[PDB]
Design a protein around this ligand. Sequence first.
Ligand SMILES: *[B]([O])([O])C1=[C]C2=C([C]=[C]C([C]N([C]=O)[C]=O)=[C]2)S1
Ligand SMILES: *[B]([O])([O])C1=[C]C2=C([C]=[C]C([C]N([C]=O)[C]=O)=[C]2)S1
Lengths: 358, 347
Amino acid sequence: APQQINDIVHRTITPLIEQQKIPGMAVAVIYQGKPYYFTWGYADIAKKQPVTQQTLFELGSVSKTFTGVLGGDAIARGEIKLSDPTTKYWPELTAKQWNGITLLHLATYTAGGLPLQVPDEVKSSSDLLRFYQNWQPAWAPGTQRLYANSSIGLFGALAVKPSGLSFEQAMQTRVFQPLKLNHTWINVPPAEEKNYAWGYREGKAVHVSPGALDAEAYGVKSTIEDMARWVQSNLKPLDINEKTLQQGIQLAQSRYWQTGDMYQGLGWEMLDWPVNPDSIINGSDNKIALAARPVKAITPPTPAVRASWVHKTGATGGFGSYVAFIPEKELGIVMLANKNYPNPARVDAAWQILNALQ
Amino acid sequence: APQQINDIVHRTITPLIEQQKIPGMAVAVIYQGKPYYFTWGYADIAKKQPVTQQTLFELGSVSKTFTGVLGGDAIARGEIKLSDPTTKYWPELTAKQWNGITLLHLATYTAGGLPLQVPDEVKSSSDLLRFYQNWQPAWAPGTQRLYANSSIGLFGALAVKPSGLSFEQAMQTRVFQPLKLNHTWINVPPAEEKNYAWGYREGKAVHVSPGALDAEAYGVKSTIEDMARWVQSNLKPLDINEKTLQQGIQLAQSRYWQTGDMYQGLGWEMLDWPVNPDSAARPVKAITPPTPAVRASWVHKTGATGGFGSYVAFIPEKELGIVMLANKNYPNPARVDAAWQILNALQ
Ligand SMILES: *[B]([O])([O])C1=[C]C2=C([C]=[C]C([C]N([C]=O)[C]=O)=[C]2)S1
Ligand SMILES: *[B]([O])([O])C1=[C]C2=C([C]=[C]C([C]N([C]=O)[C]=O)=[C]2)S1
């Protein structure tokens, strides 16, 4: 790699691993559109299996960016509209509180207080209907953003209905394959299991457990090479050959809501570039990231702005991930670790790197 | 031309010309993405000059589609946002009625009752300022559509301000040139004058007269070949090399408002295809958020000047479209009926 990149990465990430006690880490820096890779430590501590470019990490909520792009792809195909009522795609969801709640609201956490998590007792589709039928809004739709798996997870599930495909088959077929993400999985198949890293929580080896709407909200596992291609594709969607996917990516980076200096896309979140680092860093702390915030409607949505910092944090019990890129600079980073360490440490490190390189 | 295209076009347009007494006409059918041209009658009755593939016609309000695309291109460039207040790009617009009137409302005729025409007495930029300051809205923004040159025209003027180019300069360099529309003009140059058809109103040869915001609302003159290429560009924006222009086209075909069967885009108006050939202040329903360009639509615009009548319709899903240009302003329903006869037969 260029020495500038080797220098800043080693000075920033290597001490981060020390400080946070991360067992294993992979990083990709996209620079002038080209990926550069860095690896540390172990995917499996007991078996002393090192992190490689073939190591699968759990993405956690970085999966929401795949869901937002799949959803945008179904819009470009004319299969769904974000202006459509939720109940048009789930006819059994008839309770009156759902009435003005659209696909847009579900995709952007603005339905009016759907909870962060689907309760773990909710297992069957029957359980799920009852949950949603019984849910009472804390706010009117399109007034507050409350980051929620039960919001975007439902969006994902309903977005694929017109196509008749299961969520996983739509995702493999319409997103993973055209982009040649050949090692990215919702369900890791047998042949890939020796590459699937352990996550570590309080020194125990953990994998993410099943849960309602997991695939849709936090269920993607991927490699650093595939993640770098993910960033490449989102950096320049016009280079993508599949027309609906190309439009899908730009739809997921449109700005539908503003809260402070932050804009909500579909999965992706954006700020104008140049950004105030304190904002992104402190903003990624769960005290702020998980709190209700008032939103201003952007009427109509601003299309993908090139001068943007586009980003997303992800975590499962054993993993912590981060993706950020600036389309105007052809610059990005991906950070995959098999320990869930604080979000502000991730963003701070990513900012130090991308700021040094822009 | 395939005999099928040849037969439907001539069976339809011949009676049209005779019934409406149209002096000259040009038509382009776009079929499976390829253009076929047809010409009839006179560009200039007194000089016995025929309509050719190089004759320039006034487009009238079909110019609004160019204005909507150029505004869409300015959005894609990050120069403007449709969500921005009008007063952001015209600070001197301090009158309080302008509060929540955005560029969206201007583009889509939903500002609250801006008039069809800018008064003929408005003949300077401070004249124009006073006009908009003194304008009293009948309705809240985003609630009724009233088709208006003073509405879309203003949008076109504001959309180009960040660039610093005049409206004509920006249209040329950002829309005409990239699409190779080398015989499309806001102002017809002396080199092209011999191709500029006369319009005919009650038997008198007329050209469009000067007026405030003419360029932005009704000022484009074009040939059937450039108009065909305009349709090809709108049928498949993704084939366009210029990134912001490609996005600008798609933004212009997005659905922002609904009234009855019709959706309002930027300049373009759309209905779901297939469409009954058969589908004014009108209340609008906001489409929140706007639906991105729908392939399965009938996308269209009528245009008129004192002496010209034009129509463009296309269906992206079918790779199908038509342009009809005439140097007589004749009833819109006659245009649409002929266009539908032609396109229904070919789909
Ligand atoms: B994301 O921001 O990385 C998230 C992924 C999850 C969140 C909350 C809950 C769960 C799953 N779960 C129980 O519901 C785990 O115990 C995943 S936020
Ligand atoms: B379009 O639908 O073809 C139109 C072009 C014009 C219309 C109305 C009036 C004028 C001329 N004008 C300026 O606004 C003068 O009153 C052009 S509709």
